[PDB]
């Protein structure tokens, strides 16, 4: 295996292979953020679908000017 300056520079970034946090780690935080992301995606989808009308918003070409 060749040793290089860039290889030694970036070696600690590729050093902790397989290192894991115990048990469920930060899974509830990930689930909460995923739930928020799902709600955000639903909001933006229903705005484009026109099933949701935010005030001051006009999903239309005529809104360009």
């Amino acid at each position: 295996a060749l040793r290089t300056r860039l290889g030694e520079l970036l070696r600690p970034l590729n050093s902790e292979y397989g290192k894991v946090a115990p048990g469920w780690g930060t899974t509830p935080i990930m689930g909460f953020v995923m739930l928020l992301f799902a709600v955000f995606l639903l909001i933006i989808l229903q705005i484009y679908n026109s099933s949701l009308i935010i005030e001051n918003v006009d999903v239309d070409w005529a809104s360009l000017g």
Partner: protein, 95 residues
């Protein structure tokens, strides 16, 4: 009058000969007496224990340390890897 017959060039030649003779005559006079007088030494009104005064004059540390390239890499690491974010650091292996 032009060139080697111009009086201005004669004056310049005399000045140049004076400059050329300045080194032997006055260098020899300095060699005979070259401020080698026991009373001849500099004086400063500042106290010798003032901050910033070195312990020994004309210090030459050995510097058995890193090379110049490592220093340049350190100066570059100032701008691509400063110690700013290592202060905030978070606190097994899967089989």
């Amino acid at each position: 009058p032009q060139g080697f017959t111009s009086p201005k060039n004669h004056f310049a030649s005399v000045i140049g000969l004076w400059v050329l003779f300045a080194l032997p005559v006055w260098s020899a006079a300095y060699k005979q007496a070259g401020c080698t007088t026991p009373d001849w030494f500099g004086v400063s009104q500042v106290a010798e224990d003032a901050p910033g005064v070195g312990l020994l004059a004309k210090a030459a540390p050995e510097y058995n340390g890193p090379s110049f390239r490592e220093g340049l890499e350190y100066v570059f690491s100032f701008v691509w890897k400063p110690p700013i974010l290592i202060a905030w650091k978070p606190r097994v292996y899967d089989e």
